[PDB]
Amino acid sequence: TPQTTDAPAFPSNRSCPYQLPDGYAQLRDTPGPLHRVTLYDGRQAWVVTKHEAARKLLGDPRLSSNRTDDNFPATSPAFEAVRESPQAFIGLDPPEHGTRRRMTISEFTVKRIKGMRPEVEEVVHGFLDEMLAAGPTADLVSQFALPVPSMVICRLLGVPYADHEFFQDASKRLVQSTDAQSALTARNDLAGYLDGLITQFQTEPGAGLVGALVADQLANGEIDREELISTAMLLLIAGHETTASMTSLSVITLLDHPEQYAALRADRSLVPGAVEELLRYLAIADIAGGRVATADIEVEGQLIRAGEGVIVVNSIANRDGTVYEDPDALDIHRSARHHLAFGFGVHQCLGQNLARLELEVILNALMDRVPTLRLAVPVEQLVLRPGTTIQGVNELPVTWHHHH
Ligand code: HEM
Ligand SMILES: CCC(C)(C)C(=O)O[C@H]1C[C@@H](C)C=C2C=C[C@H](C)[C@H](CC[C@@H](O)C[C@@H](O)CC(=O)O)[C@H]21
């Protein structure tokens, strides 16, 4: 019998780091904003494949972010770790979501992020000194891409960087876990570490956002101790892994487009616009759109019923040709405005401007100090993460014109 189905398996893995999987490109090319897929357990779900409908549904209050809902579209067995756990505000709906998010916004405002630029530049150049002094070759992930945002978010959260080896390992084991067992164990490792940190800040008040939440909201019973752990865990893990993966993939992508990398190096005013285009193009968090409908929603003839899972795939929506002409082409000179790599609505990425600053400083630093940077292995030799997690590589062997 023929094997063609009306709801293809979802998600799919990338074979090229800066191109949609073949299964996503056909979903992008089907007409209409919605299309059925099949999750890992056999459940069917909706995916959004157009930019305007993705933007409209991300702001529709009839789509809930409640992870604990039984109908929430889980995309892997490892997802049972966050469902079975107390929720941070990413999995909350209004009004409870707003009261929790307000406790954290002070550390991510524009004026606070801009003020952090001297500190971030010191952090980037510090790890660039060490990598260049150790001689080629080098793993760009473990020696630069991961340590730089790790130290920045640790200073922002109040987490001691002296323990970086522990929680970096546990954060990997959680994000790239393939079964619920290794995911549960990694999450418990981070929870146990953070709970000890909370007790530590109750004896002597600490710094950062975690120290402030312990001395203020937790002391007044406005947040549960376990809510504080999930919130701190969310910020810690999002603070490391997203920026590290954007850096690794942005380096890979720019090295495969040397004409645009040359233009970027010649005119640094293009860096902020190239970051926006890289965010649209790469879209490393395109699974970050899971929703469950609480009421019936009509979208251009199609009907989402209450209790159905919806997955807004921002990587597909960022390749909408009616918004960005020739969407599959990298183009640092294009207007990448209104892209959905950071989401949209009340759950729009809290640390989107920290990531913009981190990537801007990092790209300028690599072009200033290692302009001869190239990949020590062919791109096809690299191992990409599957579509069930944050896009990126685990290793990135690089080399350069060395001398000292
Ligand atoms: C670097 C690339 C990044 C990308 C592509 C990205 C992407 C996203 C997306 C798409 C969402 C929406 C999730 C949803 O609607 O369910 C989101 C939310 C969020 N992100 Fe990011 N993010 C990045 C960096 C960061 C950083 C550096 C932080 C640091 C704290 C962060 C913290 C958060 C938080 C706390 C939320 C939840 C917002 C809310 O629920 O109100 N992200 N992110
Ligand atoms: C193992 C699955 C994994 C990768 C954590 C995940 O799919 O997340 C993704 C998808 C979606 C929620 C949005 C995301 C954007 C930024 C973050 C990095 C975020 C981590 C979500 C957070 O929920 C994970 C732990 O914090 C669990 C918890 O706090 O209960 C990430």
Curated annotation (Swiss-Prot):
Induction: By herbicides. InterPro entries: Cyt_P450, Cyt_P450_B, Cyt_P450_CS, Cyt_P450_sf. It is found in: Cytoplasm. Gene3D superfamilies: Cytochrome P450 (1.10.630.10). It catalyses: calciol + 2 reduced [2Fe-2S]-[ferredoxin] + O2 + 2 H(+) = calcidiol + 2 oxidized [2Fe-2S]-[ferredoxin] + H2O; calcidiol + 2 reduced [2Fe-2S]-[ferredoxin] + O2 + 2 H(+) = calcitriol + 2 oxidized [2Fe-2S]-[ferredoxin] + H2O. Residues 1-18 are annotated as: Disordered. Calciol binds at residues 75, 187, 230, 287. PROSITE patterns: CYTOCHROME_P450. Heme binds at residues 97, 101, 291, 347, 349. One of its GO terms (biological process) is vitamin D3 metabolic process. Its cofactor is heme. Involved in the metabolism of vitamin D3 (calciol) and of a number of sulfonylurea herbicides. Catalyzes the two-step hydroxylation (25- and 1-alpha-hydroxylation) of vitamin D3 (VD3) to yield its active form 1-alpha,25-dihydroxyvitamin D3 (calcitriol). The second reaction is the hydroxylation of the C1-alpha-position of calcidiol to produce calcitriol. It can also hydroxylate vitamin D2. Changing residue 287 to A: Slight increase of the hydroxylase activity. Changing residue 67 to A/F/L/V: Increase of the hydroxylase activity and decrease of affinity for both 25-hydroxyvitamin D3 and 1-alpha-hydroxyvitamin D3. Increase of the hydroxylase activity. CDD domains: CYP105-like. This is Vitamin D3 dihydroxylase. Changing residue 175 to A: Decrease of the hydroxylase activity for both 25-hydroxyvitamin D3 and 1-alpha-hydroxyvitamin D3. Residues 1-9 have a biased composition (Low complexity). GO terms for molecular function: heme binding; iron ion binding; oxidoreductase activity, acting on paired donors, with incorporation or reduction of molecular oxygen, NAD(P)H as one donor, and incorporation of one atom of oxygen. Its EC number is 1.14.15.22. Keywords: Cytoplasm, Heme, Iron, Metal-binding, Monooxygenase, Oxidoreductase. Belongs to the cytochrome P450 family. GO terms for cellular component: cytoplasm.
